[PDB]
Amino acid sequence: NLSWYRNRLYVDWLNKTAFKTDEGKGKSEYHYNAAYKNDNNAWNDNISNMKIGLPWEQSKDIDEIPPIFINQDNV
């Protein structure tokens, strides 16, 4: 998803890969990323491959999902 924040263009994405890290858990951590176009049309990189567990457990569609969007994670 695109998002216009701090007069910049952020873009955020997850990655569907399991990463059982606790090795008893399932769907434990997923990689989350961010970037921002500068005014030289050059892409920097905010977050870059940070591990976050899914807010929703297992369903393709949920009702509401906002991210904290300053370095943290909730619904």
């Binding site: 059982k20 890290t21 920097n44 990189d45 870059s48």
Partner: protein, 48 residues
């Protein structure tokens, strides 16, 4: 502009790579290789 992707790639290479009863895969010298490559880019830039 080719300086920050090298340091970010060497940051990402120190994360472990192999999972599931084989810990590790993290390249240990990746951040000094990117330091050397960044400093070579700086030398070529100053000569340009």
């Amino acid at each position: 502009a080719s300086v920050a992707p090298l340091m970010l790639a060497a940051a990402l290479d120190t994360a472990p790579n192999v999972f599931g009863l084989a810990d590790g895969g993290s390249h240990w010298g990746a951040v000094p290789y990117a330091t050397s490559a960044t400093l070579q880019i700086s030398a070529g830039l100053t000569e340009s």
